């Protein structure tokens, strides 16, 4: 899931990406 | 003298009195004497039994079960020393479940070198409370002494009076005595410990408990330090080695039991440093010829099997077992359900360890909070594993704080994993340290060390707060502390804020009235306090509530405790404010300090003021019938858990919305009174009231910061002569016998006149009384009379005030026309 | 800026990082 | 009229308006809806677009930060009925973070069939209370609605009353109305559910929601069981198949949807109990021609392969996709952060359910009370375990109280160790019966299973103690119970005895003040209650007190609660009891009951006797001047730790002293009142004072049990006429012009008389007065007078009361002699 | 008798069980 | 010790004369 990237781990703005257009 | 007789080592006795006959040679036992098992007796049996020769025990006296027996003071009436080398479970002395006993009677003994005293279980003992242990053992508190007739009941006590001295104990005197005919001996304090004569004077330095002769080496009955040739001596000199660490013997008695050992069945002695001692320690060995023991040219350490691998320290008898030992062929489980911290000896027996060949368990040790004692302790090889395969157990260590200093000390565990539960006082800091000093990071499993057992009663949030902007008022507090934010912002459940009145500045962490903030919006958090008692110093330090989580450690905020004092007021108005008029111009006050005082009380406010008598008094006849004058609380526990579980719930939402919604694509007279609780006033009307306004307030250059006056009433007393009328009476005649009385009215009476009395009688005739009130005499300028029958008549003149009735006037003679 | 994204926060993170082409959706 | 338009299954619009123009066409939503992601709006963008052709929607409808829309009124005008097929966390209505929204304006939604609605984090949304949900929801008490302006703030709600009507929701009524603008609809209790028209009929026994005209299936606007044809049918009539649980399709439409789903990449519909489904059950499988699942000759098992192998279950629709699973290929962990009990729906979903590949987890489950649900769960292999090798690993459940009825269900795990932590409200009697009955009793180590953790909320002891001698007494309770030993009677420290008033007879186990008790000495341990408020029906059980023992066991004993009424007594004296007069002769009497009642007041008694006139007035010459007659708390948790340490050490010095010892050798008037606090006395003369002696009695024919009375006075209206002087006023005039006059006293008047009043007066002269006293009166039998001018008078008597002042006489002449 | 003899209790078992013997103890 | 046998264990008649002449 998402949340366990963002909130528990932490994200970089490349992976970002990957929810976006 | 000193100590005739043979030495005696220690004995048993049991079910018999048939062997307890063998100590009647001996006066110092070396070793432990236990009385014990013994039912069937009489008190009868006893009484032709005594054995005076005893002076002084090496280890302990122990008394169990022994029936018959009443009172000690026949038994050992000459005991006076106890060294304590070898305890029983911490204990010098030891009376336990003593039937059929009334007192202890143990009148010479004076000190006890090493150990405490356990007195338990005994119905009929009594003269408990009439000694003082204090005089004998250094650590009292050590003492456990329960369940005896002392608390159960109410049994009497008689100390001789007319003798036996009296000593405080915890705030109040009461005689010391031993029995009901001996009175506990008490030597004065410069003589500390050498003991005093009959006469109260100190005896030798080298003397211990009692002497003959004071300053005398040769005339005592128990050397404080050693005993030889019937003198004692700071130390023994050569050829005589310590023995026993209380006498001095030659190379031949060592040599001689050395030997008998070695042809026998042990304690084979050694020579080492000038003592004769059982076995030498480590890195020595005793050589063929001579018994001293060589330094070894390698390291060999002392070796101490234990026996089944698992040794359970519990007691200082228990582990003095281990004394000497540097390896340790075995596993230690420490356990000491106490209640007095043991440190101090666990670390003289102990802490001479360097290697343990199992597993360290510490398990249910109350008193313990902290394992510095084992001083020399690095490696635990852990070869034999507590189940489950652990190799440092600890477990419900109800105080336990620190393990060791890391900053200096070392440790290696080779094998086995750790454990940690129910450790209150104990933070994860100190086992995650361990963790990483030992070495044994990536050997425990989850659950192997708790977290909502381990440090749940100890404040180590290790994470600060810091007050940013605190203003104090009259009474209210505002505060502000710098936001705080865990990783996870919703976790923040708000702050828990602790405020108490310190009247001390050292007050402890962790009364203590909680309040609760709502957390921060995303402008510091900040609170405003309510309804402060003034001039007070507060205590206020915040501490966080944060949601808990399993999978890591868990959080931590708090900020240090601040001391903070609300300002001064006003103060309160005086309490009980009394006045006396001791004089006709004299009025005594007296008042007590005011119930709050808010501050500090720096002077006193009394005022002065006169009231005018009532003028409906002074337009009235009084004359008249009827002149009858007057004469002058927590939180629910569920709830808590709701309001957890509701916001646990809100962040669960969120998360799985998260998850399925994103996708990765690939004025009056006064006067100031100073510190005076009582005033005297001077030049007042006498038989006059006032009205006394008295101020307790506690500013005088700055302004008065104070409240209301205290209204009371105070009359003064009257003259005594003031209703005396002065002046003479002048008497007018007119033609018809009208006779018109005049006189002069007294100007300065006790407050007022309300009426005067005129009895005029003939000589010889009834006396004639007349009143004549304010608005008569102001009308008549006196007394007027009609028709008088001749003859000589005399008038007394007399008035009336408020105080009460005046003296009568002398009487004037005058005399009527007869036509 | 590398920091712990969670919930609202996420939600303005990813409104940052992207909304010229808007947010992915699988057909 | 029913539904036009095409079906358009469930879509998904995005950060823009543009994809949402595709639900013009369309009046049925098969499918979910959801409006999310919208940033880039502006609330005109909304006002020109309007989808009014919606009806209702089967799944859920979701919006999710949509920027701009301020009410849903003009975007769905005619929804409905929300069928709730599958959810959405449980939830059919999820409004969430709808910043710049003011009002729902769902005006026509009326039933929601399954499922719950959240609204969250909306700022600017009112009208929430404004809306009864009871009337769409079946379990409105499944709503989560927080964080909102209804709440935070005090926004006016403005519902026009001039016509919205008013329900009760807790105790008070209110008007319901969606928006400023639309009254919420209700409908008559007789149309429970089928919808009413404008006027308020009952529509069709089929409809659902709104109907156009009452009493026809092709009139309604949601068909409520089945669609068919513009037409509601209770089932799908032959050759038509139920579908989707709310429309009726034929073969071919079941058939087309089929082939492409094999013909493309899912849903391979099959058919089976006269109902298209995409899977059908387990034992069937389809055949190749017809799309009928016939039964299989043998056991074949509907596997659910779990990805990863582990999969989370936390809401309705995260349980819903294993609906119909046999054999779980995986592990399931059960976690449910909750606070409301979703155990029907568990149930439903899950419990069909046979064999779990994986593990069993239930981490956290707050709502869950029992594990019943999985009705059909057997065999847990255990072929993947939980890290540490577990296969049932049940932790911090905080309300899990049964694991399975043991009495008929069955269990079997493989392999993997059990686990067991935090469950405050399971006792160790369930896990170890579940050990027992699964098979695993030899599997487990130690700390597998806490002991501290589990039950310690729950009074489950397992030992029973019964009350041998329980006695009432006026305040007191005397109490005995059989003696408790456990097999080390040393281990008791006493008992806990708990009390507390019970007005009602169920009463929770485990206020409720604590006492502690002495364990018994070696008789039946017993104790004696202090201070009951009398007539009140208490509790009692008696808890034991134990020491915690680690190896087994803890122990247990305690006593089920018993129910005790302490007896009646005598009550309090009566509140306020005033009186007041209401006629020369009556007099009202008002009371309330005693605020101690002690029982059941059968009646009351009032006691009346007069006082007598006061004789003092009866001596007094009121004539003279001066004749103003009167017109009428817990216990420390270090303490007990304390005395459990001290107790646990004298057991171990015992312990070890046994040890070492022993070696293994190889009258007035009144009335009764019943039932009345109020009360007229007749019959009492005027002016005269009654002492009230008001009794509150609660117990008549078995003597009177009541205490003592309240004392009040009251004095009755004046008569009309009393102070008037009756019979003629009688003149009599002596030789030398003196004047006696005599007249009849008022006998009985109003209390007594003090003084009389005579004026005469000459004709044309001046009125003279005069007064006669109660002696005047006694001793001259009236007035007399002395030297009188002649002339004709007028003389007039009146009379003086306690009343006040009394009527004059009729005037009478007389003329005095000239001489 | 089978029970559990701890305390003073096990004190009155040992002396009933035996005293006419006397109780034991090593040399 | 014999206290392991009695208090926390089972003693029967036979043992306790180990702890008696």
Known sequence: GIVEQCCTSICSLYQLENYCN | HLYPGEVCPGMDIRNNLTRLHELENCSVIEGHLQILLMFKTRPEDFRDLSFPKLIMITDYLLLFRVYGLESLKDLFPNLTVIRGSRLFFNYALVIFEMVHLKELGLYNLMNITRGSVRIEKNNELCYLATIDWSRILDSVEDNYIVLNKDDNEECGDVCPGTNCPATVINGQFVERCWTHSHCQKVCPTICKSHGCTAEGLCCHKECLGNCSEPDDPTKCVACRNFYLDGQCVETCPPPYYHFQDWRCVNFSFCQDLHFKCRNSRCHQYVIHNNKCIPECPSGYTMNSSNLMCTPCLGPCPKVCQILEGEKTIDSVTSAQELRGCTVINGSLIINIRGGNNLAAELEANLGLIEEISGFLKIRRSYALVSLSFFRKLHLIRGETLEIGNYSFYALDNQNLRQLWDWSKHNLTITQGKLFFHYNPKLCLSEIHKMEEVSGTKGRQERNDIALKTNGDQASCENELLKFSFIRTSFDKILLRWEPYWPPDFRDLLGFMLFYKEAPYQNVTEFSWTVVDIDPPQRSHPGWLMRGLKPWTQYAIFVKTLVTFSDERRTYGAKSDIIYVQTDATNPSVPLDPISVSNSSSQIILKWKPPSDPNGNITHYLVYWERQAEDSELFELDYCLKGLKLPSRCPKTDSQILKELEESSFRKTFEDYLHNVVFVPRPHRPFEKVVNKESLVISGLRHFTGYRIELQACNQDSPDERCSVAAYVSARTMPEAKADDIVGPVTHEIFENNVVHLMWQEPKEPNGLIVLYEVSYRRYGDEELHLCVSRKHFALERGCRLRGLSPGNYSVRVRATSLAGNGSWTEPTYFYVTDY | ?27
């Open chain 3, 1 to 27: 800026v590398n920091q712990h994204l969670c919930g609202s926060h996420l939600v303005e993170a990813l409104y940052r990082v992207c909304g010229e082409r808007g947010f992915f959706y699988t057909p």
